[PDB]
């Protein structure tokens, strides 16, 4: 996260760290949506251009973390993966359209003060909250700068959803209805954005109607990190909820 701040303890209890077994390193962010399901970006698991094709046995899921590098003994919980499900129409060949994936844990994780699931949006949630100007929150243990370092603790930053025309005019890449972008404009002064390592993490919003946190997006892609005139792009969670439900009530 660039231009963000240290998260408070238990501020994002649904935050998940996708950890590579060997070499031991952070590979992506993710989120907890139930006691056995974790949501992330498909590009975190599959990206042929860079020879990335992780299998269930290559990763671990670390939940309830705050520190990036330390093993938080009596607090975090490390889970093994049973199966990975990538969206059938994930477009890694072009623009990362439908950049979404689900991971089923081998055993249900026990919730605690530091481990708790986030809600997924329904049609009405999306309609009222996904509007230009409305701010969401992005979290992760990714890089602090596009090029320099790395955080000792989970980082957080609030960013406003950007008008679709502005998102499209900021890039040469084809934007789809399954993506939305967020971030401050050059003339807004404020800054912030996700960066390498934050991929797959959640973009959440707190409903003013029922005061619950909803994951509206997944950190998907961007051109560089926190560059003026550029914006971070996120997977539109509600637009792909049908797929999410299909996989859950099929192998759940």
């Amino acid at each position: 996260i660039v231009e963000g701040s240290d998260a408070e303890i238990g501020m994002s209890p649904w935050q998940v760290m996708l950890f590579r077994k060997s070499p031991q390193e952070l590979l992506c962010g993710a989120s907890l949506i139930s006691d056995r399901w974790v949501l992330t970006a498909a590009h975190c698991l599959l990206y042929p251009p860079w020879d990335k094709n992780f299998t269930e046995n290559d990763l671990l899921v670390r939940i309830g973390k705050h520190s990036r590098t330390r093993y938080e003994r009596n607090i975090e919980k490390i889970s093994m993966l049973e199966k990975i499900y990538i969206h059938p129409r994930y477009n890694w060949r072009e623009n990362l359209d439908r950049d979404i994936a689900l991971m089923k844990l081998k055993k249900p994780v026990a919730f605690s003060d530091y481990i708790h699931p986030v809600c997924l949006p329904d049609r009405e949630t999306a309609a009222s909250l996904l509007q230009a100007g409305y701010k969401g929150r992005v979290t992760g243990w990714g890089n602090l700068k596009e090029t320099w370092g790395q955080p000792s603790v989970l980082q957080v930053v609030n960013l406003p959803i950007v008008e679709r025309p502005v998102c499209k005019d900021s890039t040469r890449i084809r934007i789809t209805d399954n993506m939305f972008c967020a971030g401050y404009k050059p003339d807004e002064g404020k800054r912030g954005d996700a960066c390498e390592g934050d991929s797959g993490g959640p973009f959440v919003m707190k409903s003013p109607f029922n005061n619950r946190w909803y994951q509206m997006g997944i950190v998907s892609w961007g051109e560089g990190c926190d560059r003026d005139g550029k914006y971070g792009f996120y997977t539109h969670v509600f637009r792909l909820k049908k797929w999410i439900q299909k996989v859950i009530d099929q192998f759940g």
Partner: peptide
């Protein structure tokens, strides 16, 4: 680098 983890 990261701190080593156990049994997992």
């Amino acid at each position: 680098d990261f701190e080593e983890i156990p049994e997992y």
